[PDB]
Amino acid sequence: MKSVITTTISAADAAGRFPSSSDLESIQGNIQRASARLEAAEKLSGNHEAVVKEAGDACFAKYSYLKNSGEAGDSQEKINKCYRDVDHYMRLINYSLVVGGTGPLDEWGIAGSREVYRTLNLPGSAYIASFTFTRDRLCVPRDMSSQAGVEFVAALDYVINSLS
Amino acid sequence: MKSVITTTISAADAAGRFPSSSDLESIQGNIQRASARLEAAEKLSGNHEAVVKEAGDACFAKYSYLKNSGEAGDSQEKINKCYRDVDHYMRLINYSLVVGGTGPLDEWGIAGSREVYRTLNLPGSAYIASFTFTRDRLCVPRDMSSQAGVEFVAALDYVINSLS
Amino acid sequence: MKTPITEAIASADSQGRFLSNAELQSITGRYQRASASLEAAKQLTGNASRLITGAAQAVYTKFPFVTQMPGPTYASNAIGKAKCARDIGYYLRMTTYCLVVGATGPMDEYLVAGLEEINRSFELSPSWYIAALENIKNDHGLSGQAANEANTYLDYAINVLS
Amino acid sequence: CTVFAPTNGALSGERYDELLADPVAARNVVLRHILPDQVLTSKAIKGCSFWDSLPGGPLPYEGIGPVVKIAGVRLLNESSDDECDNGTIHVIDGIISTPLAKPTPFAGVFEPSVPMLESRDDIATAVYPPVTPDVRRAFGAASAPSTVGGRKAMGLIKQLPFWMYGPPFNASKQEDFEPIS
Amino acid sequence: MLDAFAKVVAQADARGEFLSNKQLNSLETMIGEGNKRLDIVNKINSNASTIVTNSARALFAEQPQLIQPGGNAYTSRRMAACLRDMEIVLRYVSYAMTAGDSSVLDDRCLNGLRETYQALGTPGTSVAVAIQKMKEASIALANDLNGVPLGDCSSLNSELAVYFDRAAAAVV
Amino acid sequence: MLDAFSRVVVNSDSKAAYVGGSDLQSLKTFISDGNKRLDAVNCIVSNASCIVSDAISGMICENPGLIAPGGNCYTNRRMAACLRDGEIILRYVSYALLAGDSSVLDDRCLNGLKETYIALGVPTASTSRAVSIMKAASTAFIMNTASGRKIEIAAGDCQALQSEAAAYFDKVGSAVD
Amino acid sequence: MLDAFSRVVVNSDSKAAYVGGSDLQSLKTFISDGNKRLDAVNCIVSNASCIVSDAISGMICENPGLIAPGGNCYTNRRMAACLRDGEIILRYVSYALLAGDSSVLDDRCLNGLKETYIALGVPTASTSRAVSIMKAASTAFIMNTASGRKIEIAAGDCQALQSEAAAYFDKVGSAVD
Amino acid sequence: MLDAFSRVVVNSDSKAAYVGGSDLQSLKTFISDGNKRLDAVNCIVSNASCIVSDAISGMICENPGLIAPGGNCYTNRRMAACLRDGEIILRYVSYALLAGDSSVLDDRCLNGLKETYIALGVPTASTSRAVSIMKAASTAFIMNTASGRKIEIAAGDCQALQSEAAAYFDKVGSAVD
Numbered sequence A, B: 001m002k003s004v005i006t007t008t009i010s011a012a013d014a015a016g017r018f019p020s021s022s023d024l025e026s027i028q029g030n031i032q033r034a035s036a037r038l039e040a041a042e043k044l045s046g047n048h049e050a051v052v053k054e055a056g057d058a059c060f061a062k063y064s065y066l067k068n069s070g071e072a073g074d075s076q077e078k079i080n081k082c083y084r085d086v087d088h089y090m091r092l093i094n095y096s097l098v099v100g101g102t103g104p105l106d107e108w109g110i111a112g113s114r115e116v117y118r119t120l121n122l123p124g125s126a127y128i129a130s131f132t133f134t135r136d137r138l139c140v141p142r143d144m145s146s147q148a149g150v151e152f153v154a155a156l157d158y159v160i161n162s163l164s
Numbered sequence C: 001m002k003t004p005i006t007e008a009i010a011s012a013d014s015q016g017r018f019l020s021n022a023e024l025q026s027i028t029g030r031y032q033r034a035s036a037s038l039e040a041a042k043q044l045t046g047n048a049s050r051l052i053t054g055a056a057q058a059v060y061t062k063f064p065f066v067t068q069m070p071g072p073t074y075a076s077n078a079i080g081k082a083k084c085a086r087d088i089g090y091y092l093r094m095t096t097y098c099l100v101v102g103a104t105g106p107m108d109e110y111l112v113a114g115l116e117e118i119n120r121s122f123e124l125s126p127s128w129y130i131a132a133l134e135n136i137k138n139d140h141g142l143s144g145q146a147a148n149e150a151n152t153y154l155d156y157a158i159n160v161l162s
Numbered sequence D: 001c002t003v004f005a006p007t008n009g010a011l012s013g014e015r016y017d018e019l020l021a022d023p024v025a026a027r028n029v030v031l032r033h034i035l036p037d038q039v040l041t042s043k044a045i046k047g048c049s050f051w052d053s054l055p056g057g058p059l060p061y062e063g064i065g066p067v068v069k070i071a072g073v074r075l076l077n078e079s080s081d082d083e084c085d086n087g088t089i090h091v092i093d094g095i096i097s098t099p100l101a102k103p104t105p106f107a108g109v110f111e112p113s114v115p116m117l118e119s120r121d122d123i124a125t126a127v128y129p130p131v132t133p134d135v136r137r138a139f140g141a142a143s144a145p146s147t148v149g150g151r152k153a154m155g156l157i158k159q160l161p162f163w164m165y166g167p168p169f170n171a172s173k174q175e176d177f178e179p180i181s
Numbered sequence E: 001m002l003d004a005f006a007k008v009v010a011q012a013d014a015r016g017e018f019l020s021n022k023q024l025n026s027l028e029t030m031i032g033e034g035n036k037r038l039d040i041v042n043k044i045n046s047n048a049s050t051i052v053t054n055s056a057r058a059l060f061a062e063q064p065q066l067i068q069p070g071g072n073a074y075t076s077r078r079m080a081a082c083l084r085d086m087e088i089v090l091r092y093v094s095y096a097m098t099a100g101d102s103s104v105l106d107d108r109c110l111n112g113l114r115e116t117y118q119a120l121g122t123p124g125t126s127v128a129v130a131i132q133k134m135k136e137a138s139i140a141l142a143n144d145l146n147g148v149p150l151g152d153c154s155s156l157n158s159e160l161a162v163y164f165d166r167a168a169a170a171v172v
Numbered sequence F, G, H: 001m002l003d004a005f006s007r008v009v010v011n012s013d014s015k016a017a018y019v020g021g022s023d024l025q026s027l028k029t030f031i032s033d034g035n036k037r038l039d040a041v042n043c044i045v046s047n048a049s050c051i052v053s054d055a056i057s058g059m060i061c062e063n064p065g066l067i068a069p070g071g072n073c074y075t076n077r078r079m080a081a082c083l084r085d086g087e088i089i090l091r092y093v094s095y096a097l098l099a100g101d102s103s104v105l106d107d108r109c110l111n112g113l114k115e116t117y118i119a120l121g122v123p124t125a126s127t128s129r130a131v132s133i134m135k136a137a138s139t140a141f142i143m144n145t146a147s148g149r150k151i152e153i154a155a156g157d158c159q160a161l162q163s164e165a166a167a168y169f170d171k172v173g174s175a176v177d
């Protein structure tokens, strides 16, 4: 699970040395950017339900054909799997946002996704519609602090650029 | 006009000495802060007309009674003088903002303002309503980066504390 | 001789083509810098004798053994002083020729070509001459672009000698 | 009409002086922004399709709740919907470009602020260069030859660390070359 | 071989477009800079032999290695080859100062020179010290207020310095 | 593989002295301009596949003989590797934006690529076209002047940073030609 | 009393318009040339005591009738007031170098001076000669070309400043005549 | 009345010595810049009636109290006089452009102006506004940047000369105030 401290410990471990001052500066930067990350994590755990609700609502506001032909989530159950999947996604954005690297988001969500969305006839463009709605909606000084909003946007963009 | 240059030259002239290193450090500070303030002046000359509109419209949005009777705002023409005097004050904020001391805004706007405003039944509270509206409409991190905005705040503060 | 015009024509002649716009622009620019060059040539021609005399006095004050050293090559004889002002006069005349031509042609074909064998075979040190050209560079008394011209060609002779 | 009006901050720039320089391009842009025959509120957009009745070509709009994008350009819902008794003027983030009026490419536009920068190994010095000091000592050596100027000739000898004056190296100092030594 | 103009035209043809008026304004600006350019090239071409000689004197004074027996510089032959190489580098830096592009220097002098000075056993860093000294002498010489009408020339000194820095960077 | 710090040190090592005041002053201006470099790299990284997609698609649409049978973009496999190549070039340019010196880009990817594209039969003018499109796109994202994305940041001037990034892309584009 | 700043502001005030983008551009040149201005006035100030002595002694040497009986430098007192006036002229010129505008020199010293020296009998020709000597001496110190003093300053072109200082001295010498 | 030549001569006679090199050098520059001076004064003795018309008309339109009753441009007679005075001011400025020294302008026109306009009751600020409009119009004509008139001339930089002409108009406008 990739973070600042796991990269530097794993790198010095691959080296075969005790941690020099470089790793110490890296973890110093971890404890500098920490406050903005954890603020974003607090607000995400605050309103996750309304975020996922707006995400799925806009995702079917864009693409109506998922419902139209039994070739997508046309049964209330499949749309419940839809909002569940976006729940998983915001949960992984919260986890990578706490860790501060893209580690848990990559290994739990992104790694091996392509076989799953490919095999199970799941379109990625609809996911991207959901995330880009939750991305376009955000205001930096309206709710989140500027530094935390940046962190949030960055992580969500990572999800988009890892998806398609 | 009170600036850094005029105060140190005038003070050394009253001293009866050559300008020593102290005045030199003063003008050193002037050429340090110069860029931040001048960015403010450029942006002020950018959108001053909308500052006229929102300033005066908020000024009568607070006090409606000026448009009610004959007293100070009987006609549309006196309202044109209202917007006009607001643009005078913004032009003096541009001037003192360029000079960097409060010189031209003091000797052109503030000096003798009280006999005029007291004589012609002009209330200061509507001016203060306008200027407090302008400082409430400060777009810092998107329009006036940081310190340009700070210099603008300081000058307009001096305007209100001169009038009130 | 190496004039700018003859470089232009010689290059186009070796290519066998005509004298297209490149070389014509070259001759234009020569015709513009030519005026300052001609003024400089006029004033060097004007005060030649005092430049030569002054230069020989500077060489004699810088190297005082030369008038004292008994020999053929040194300026102890009256003959030696005549050869002294003779040679300084040569350098001044070749500088005026290069000012008139506009390139270093006459100095490179009348003076620079073969100067080493002469300064060796008669044991004439390059440095004595350098001091002469420095006094000419100081005392020509031109001003402006004319002074830049004469200082250019005199400096050029200095960098030939070393 | 629905009047798609860009903000002041978005309007100004180099392409702005291009449009003030040309009547043709300016006319085509102003006709590109304005729709005829419809009055549209912010919440009546609703979907992703095209608009025909225009000069340039069909306009792509993506309408989702508020996150409205017009040609890929978002509109600002702070000042989007205004009554104008005949239409409504919606304000846009950017400039909608025609296929008619095409902007100049990057090589026609761009110049670097910092020169020679594809030729310098060190980015740190080139972007923030220090001032060059005096040059009197160095010019005294670069000017005249070695017999002309006497003592200065060494001039260019700068200062080595103390060990390099040492006996395995035996460096020289400028006081050695002078007559005073 | 490419100057400023040939580089602009060559890129404009590598994309196949014309020159915009922005490009043409840039060219006009560089032309107005061109008199100052010719002045710096004139100063270099004038004092060049004293530059090479004085810079070699400072080199042998600060590094007394090469003049001693078994030194790369050593022998009459080897000393003359040393001086001549410095004259070569100074000549092409005068050329790239005129062209405005660093192409002629790379094409005629720098590119492939490292393979030679490796192939002879010549210490590269000593050559780099030599070129740093000609940069100091040349830059200082270029900043002389004698004989020229006075004017602002920091950009041209910066560029000239970039050329010498490229020479010392290509030997080392 | 050298940053601004290492480059100064290497230069002061050939000079064989300590770092000194002038060099440290310029390096202090580097560190004070550090967060602009941070936000810059964040911009190019969070528009990566966007830049590569538009750039190579523009390269095909400008010169449509690449997708014609016989061109080097004629198969899915060739198009995938070409797309991948564009992503890798943008990747090491992003590293040169972090490090401040092009030592990582010169030593890693720029070295040997011209001769590889010669050995493959890749047309070099088309690659320099792709690099140029990534240059204009990348400077447009780095200055927040994209026509599809305008995110909010603190105001400031980064003309110097933009000239630096344009210097790296012109280094790659000049390096393949 | 007006600096360069207030000169731009007063000129903009007369036309009842905002400062704008070109006047500020000329004032940006004032700011960027700031340290050279500082160092120049430092050069004028550091040697100011030396300049007045030399100029007045040169004024007497050019014109020996000053020291002659019933001349205005005859009595010891008169030589003292003479030295003081040279010092005050130098003083205001240095202020005009700091300000960048000659409002200080025109208002505080220059205005009503010809009629004063006429009313006192002071020879105008002699004063303008002394102002000319301070002019040449001041430009020589400001360009670091003085014989008795050659101090190190990092190099650059100071041509704009020298013409400025020469303009103030020519204003004084043209004012006494 | 003194030109540049008589200025050199007068300065050298104050010094009480021969003419020498350096003064003559500056005067050589005067001669080589002679034709630009010629063409500049020709540009101001060209559309000059146009200048005075536009400037006084601009002075009345900027300040409408002149044409108001009991203003100094009210009566037709008074308008004739103001136009005549605008003409004369531009005339002596043109003389100062030919001479190259402001001796003619100072002695013939400038000396009695402040007292005279006070003795007539002429508002001085309005006059200085009209001198400013003549200044800007004259510099635009002298730089070939007039909108209604663009006459082709052998090209060259002429900034020196523009600043010279602006120096004389500023001398007049500062003289009336």
Ligand SMILES: *[C@@H](C)[C@H]1/C(=C/C2=NC(=C\c3[nH]c(C[C@H]4NC(=O)C(C=C)=C4C)c(C)c3CCC(=O)O)/C(CCC(=O)O)=C2C)NC(=O)[C@@H]1C
Pocket (backbone or CB within 6 Å): B021, B024, B025, B028, D131, G032, G033, G035, G036, G037, G038, G039, G040, G042, G142, G143, G144, G153, G154, G155, G156, G157, G158, G161
């Ligand atoms: C003409 C006046 C001179 C010339 C002056 C230059 N000075 C340059 C730079 C520079 N000068 C100072 C000293 C100045 N600044 C101050 O704050 C004070 C006193 C409080 C003084 C007296 C500084 C600090 C600097 C910059 C930093 C540094 O050099 O370490 C300079 C370089 C160009 C520029 O910075 O604009 C020049 C040209 N130089 C000349 O050759 C003539 C003789």
Ligand SMILES: *[C@H](C)[C@H]1/C(=C/C2=NC(=C\c3[nH]c(C[C@H]4NC(=O)C(C=C)=C4C)c(C)c3CCC(=O)O)/C(CCC(=O)O)=C2C)NC(=O)[C@@H]1C
Pocket (backbone or CB within 6 Å): F066, F071, F072, F073, F077, F078, F079, F081, F082, F083, F085, F086, F088, F089, F108, F109, F113, F116, F120, F122, F123, F126, F127, F130
């Ligand atoms: C895109 C603008 C080109 C083109 C690209 C193609 N590249 C192909 C092969 C290939 N490319 C590279 C360079 C790349 N590999 C790396 O490791 C790095 C940097 C670390 C880079 C920049 C290599 C080494 C190779 C050979 C190995 C491989 O096949 O991946 C390629 C396949 C060519 C073929 O098999 O015929 C293509 C098509 N496509 C184009 O249309 C333009 C010219």
Ligand SMILES: C=CC1=C(C)[C@@H](Cc2[nH]c(/C=C3N=C(/C=C4\NC(=O)[C@H](C)[C@H]4CC)C(C)=C\3CCC(=O)O)c(CCC(=O)O)c2C)NC1=O
Pocket (backbone or CB within 6 Å): A059, A066, A072, A073, A074, A078, A079, A081, A082, A083, A085, A086, A088, A089, A108, A109, A116, A120, A122, A123, A126, A127, A130
């Ligand atoms: C840890 C993270 C994590 C995720 C992110 C999900 C991702 C995920 N989704 C599905 C599976 C699914 N996901 C969806 C969701 C969709 N319905 C649509 O209309 C939209 C396109 C989309 C919501 C936006 C649907 C409908 C299925 C079932 C697909 C099917 O069986 O046809 C599956 C296969 C197993 C299953 O059936 O549940 C997986 C792994 N699971 C995880 O473990």
Ligand SMILES: C=CC1=C(C)[C@@H](Cc2[nH]c(/C=C3N=C(/C=C4\NC(=O)[C@H](C)[C@H]4CC)C(C)=C\3CCC(=O)O)c(CCC(=O)O)c2C)NC1=O
Pocket (backbone or CB within 6 Å): A040, A043, A044, A045, A046, A047, A048, A050, A051, A054, A137, A138, A139, A140, A142, A143, A144, D077, D078
């Ligand atoms: C954890 C992270 C996190 C966020 C980033 C926000 C994002 C967010 N914003 C809103 C909701 C909102 N957000 C805004 C903000 C805007 N007003 C405008 O003029 C601008 C376009 C923009 C500020 C830049 C507004 C106005 C609403 C209410 C919209 C409405 O009800 O019409 C909602 C729906 C719930 C609500 O009403 O609060 C959510 C999830 N919430 C979160 O939990």
Ligand SMILES: C=CC1=C(C)[C@@H](Cc2[nH]c(/C=C3N=C(/C=C4\NC(=O)[C@H](C)[C@H]4CC)C(C)=C\3CCC(=O)O)c(CCC(=O)O)c2C)NC1=O
Pocket (backbone or CB within 6 Å): B059, B066, B072, B073, B078, B079, B081, B082, B083, B085, B086, B088, B089, B108, B109, B116, B120, B122, B123, B126, B127
């Ligand atoms: C240089 C700066 C500068 C200013 C700031 C103004 C200030 C100013 N305003 C007025 C004069 C006036 N100012 C106003 C303005 C007002 N109308 C109202 O309803 C509001 C209370 C208020 C606008 C917010 C009015 C109405 C008059 C005329 C008052 C009257 O004649 O009754 C006067 C007297 C001269 C005149 O009548 O114009 C002055 C000096 N003038 C200047 O020279």
Ligand SMILES: C=CC1=C(C)[C@@H](Cc2[nH]c(/C=C3N=C(/C=C4\NC(=O)[C@H](C)[C@H]4CC)C(C)=C\3CCC(=O)O)c(CCC(=O)O)c2C)NC1=O
Pocket (backbone or CB within 6 Å): C059, C066, C067, C071, C072, C073, C074, C075, C076, C079, C080, C081, C083, C084, C085, C087, C090, C091, C110, C111, C118, C122, C124, C128, C129, C132
């Ligand atoms: C075309 C260019 C050109 C020159 C530059 C001269 C160079 C020159 N000088 C001499 C010859 C000479 N040159 C000098 C001059 C010197 N006397 C001294 O005291 C000083 C060291 C020095 C003057 C600075 C003397 C004295 C001789 C005669 C030497 C002798 O016979 O001993 C000779 C041999 C022929 C002769 O005797 O004249 C030549 C070729 N001749 C040329 O044709």
Ligand SMILES: C=CC1=C(C)[C@@H](Cc2[nH]c(/C=C3N=C(/C=C4\NC(=O)[C@H](C)[C@H]4CC)C(C)=C\3CCC(=O)O)c(CCC(=O)O)c2C)NC1=O
Pocket (backbone or CB within 6 Å): E066, E072, E073, E074, E078, E079, E081, E082, E083, E085, E086, E088, E089, E108, E109, E113, E116, E120, E122, E123, E124, E126, E127, E130
């Ligand atoms: C067109 C461009 C061009 C160059 C740049 C040179 C480069 C060059 N130098 C040498 C050759 C040489 N170059 C030097 C120079 C050096 N002496 C030292 O003490 C220093 C390390 C260094 C000067 C800074 C020496 C000494 C030799 C001879 C080496 C030897 O024979 O041992 C040679 C081999 C041929 C020869 O012997 O001359 C070449 C090609 N030649 C060219 O044609």
Ligand SMILES: C=CC1=C(C)[C@@H](Cc2[nH]c(/C=C3N=C(/C=C4\NC(=O)[C@H](C)[C@H]4CC)C(C)=C\3CCC(=O)O)c(CCC(=O)O)c2C)NC1=O
Pocket (backbone or CB within 6 Å): C033, C145, E035, E036, E038, E039, E040, E042, E142, E143, E144, E145, E148, E149, E150, E151, E152, E153, G157
């Ligand atoms: C054929 C060869 C050749 C040259 C060598 C130049 C030499 C030269 N330079 C200038 C002119 C000039 N040269 C410079 C250059 C300088 N700026 C400074 O700060 C430094 C002292 C110096 C650069 C090192 C400047 C500034 C001018 C303009 C001077 C002025 O107008 O004040 C002029 C007058 C014409 C003009 O304005 O361009 C000439 C002839 N011209 C030529 O035709």
Ligand SMILES: C=CC1=C(C)[C@@H](Cc2[nH]c(/C=C3N=C(/C=C4\NC(=O)[C@H](C)[C@H]4CC)C(C)=C\3CCC(=O)O)c(CCC(=O)O)c2C)NC1=O
Pocket (backbone or CB within 6 Å): A033, A147, B145, B146, F034, F035, F036, F038, F039, F040, F042, F043, F142, F143, F144, F153, F154, F155, F156, F157, F158
């Ligand atoms: C770990 C990741 C990380 C980042 C991504 C940055 C992001 C970041 N940038 C700034 C701060 C800044 N960032 C910029 C950058 C900009 N200049 C412009 O012209 C463009 C819009 C933009 C470059 C594309 C500027 C100018 C500032 C300073 C803003 C100001 O002080 O006005 C700050 C505030 C602290 C500071 O002043 O440095 C932060 C946190 N910092 C981090 O720690």
Ligand SMILES: C=CC1=C(C)[C@@H](Cc2[nH]c(/C=C3N=C(/C=C4\NC(=O)[C@H](C)[C@H]4CC)C(C)=C\3CCC(=O)O)c(CCC(=O)O)c2C)NC1=O
Pocket (backbone or CB within 6 Å): H032, H033, H034, H035, H036, H037, H038, H039, H040, H041, H042, H142, H143, H144, H153, H154, H155, H156, H157, H158, H161
């Ligand atoms: C008897 C009447 C009389 C005149 C009216 C002038 C006309 C005149 N001007 C120039 C020549 C010139 N005139 C100008 C003048 C300027 N160029 C600019 O771009 C500016 C707009 C303008 C500022 C004044 C310039 C720059 C030259 C060329 C440079 C020069 O010759 O000094 C020449 C040189 C010959 C030629 O060009 O053919 C002549 C004769 N001389 C006279 O004898």
Ligand SMILES: C=CC1=C(C)[C@@H](Cc2[nH]c(/C=C3N=C(/C=C4\NC(=O)[C@H](C)[C@H]4CC)C(C)=C\3CCC(=O)O)c(CCC(=O)O)c2C)NC1=O
Pocket (backbone or CB within 6 Å): H066, H071, H072, H073, H074, H078, H079, H081, H082, H083, H085, H086, H088, H089, H108, H109, H113, H116, H120, H122, H123, H124, H126, H127, H130
């Ligand atoms: C040689 C130089 C020279 C001058 C500069 C003028 C200056 C001057 N003007 C006037 C006289 C005058 N000047 C003006 C001009 C003015 N009208 C206004 O509205 C403005 C304030 C101003 C123009 C800007 C007017 C109106 C008169 C006549 C005044 C009167 O009779 O009331 C007079 C008195 C004689 C006369 O009536 O003509 C003089 C000496 N005359 C000269 O010989």
Ligand SMILES: CCC1=C(C)[C@@H](CC2=N/C(=C\c3[nH]c(C[C@@H]4NC(=O)C(C)=C4CC)c(C)c3CCC(=O)O)C(CCC(=O)O)=C2C)NC1=O
Pocket (backbone or CB within 6 Å): D104, D105, D106, D107, F050, F051, F053, F054, F055, F057, F058, F061, F132, F133, F136, F137, F138, F140, F141, F145, F146, F147, F148, F149
């Ligand atoms: C029909 C075949 C075709 C394409 C594919 C495009 C490709 C393309 N993009 C460009 C250039 C370009 N592309 C982008 C990136 C892009 N824009 C954004 O706002 C976002 C979010 C992006 C990624 C999704 C930017 C930012 C620019 C710079 C121009 C601009 O300001 O938009 C340019 C101009 C190149 C130049 O200036 O030389 C081209 C040709 N053009 C075509 O003809």
Ligand SMILES: CCC1=C(C)[C@@H](CC2=N/C(=C\c3[nH]c(C[C@@H]4NC(=O)C(C)=C4CC)c(C)c3CCC(=O)O)C(CCC(=O)O)=C2C)NC1=O
Pocket (backbone or CB within 6 Å): G050, G051, G054, G055, G057, G058, G061, G062, G132, G133, G136, G137, G140, G141, G145, G146, G147, G148, G149
């Ligand atoms: C016998 C009666 C007498 C004098 C008294 C002097 C006075 C004098 N000083 C001059 C000019 C002059 N004076 C100085 C200042 C002076 N020089 C220095 O190097 C130091 C340290 C100084 C103060 C101690 C300088 C720097 C100059 C400029 C000339 C120069 O480069 O030295 C000039 C030339 C004026 C001109 O150029 O128009 C004169 C006349 N001359 C006389 O005939």
Ligand SMILES: CCC1=C(C)[C@@H](CC2=N/C(=C\c3[nH]c(C[C@@H]4NC(=O)C(C)=C4CC)c(C)c3CCC(=O)O)C(CCC(=O)O)=C2C)NC1=O
Pocket (backbone or CB within 6 Å): G015, H047, H050, H051, H053, H054, H055, H057, H058, H059, H061, H062, H133, H136, H137, H140, H141, H145, H146, H147, H148, H149
């Ligand atoms: C409504 C009341 C009124 C006027 C009257 C004008 C008067 C006027 N002329 C100006 C300035 C001005 N005037 C002219 C002269 C003029 N233009 C020509 O091309 C020809 C042939 C002329 C004489 C017929 C020139 C050349 C300029 C300079 C601007 C320009 O380039 O046109 C300026 C600008 C002043 C400044 O820059 O400070 C003004 C105010 N303006 C007004 O508001």
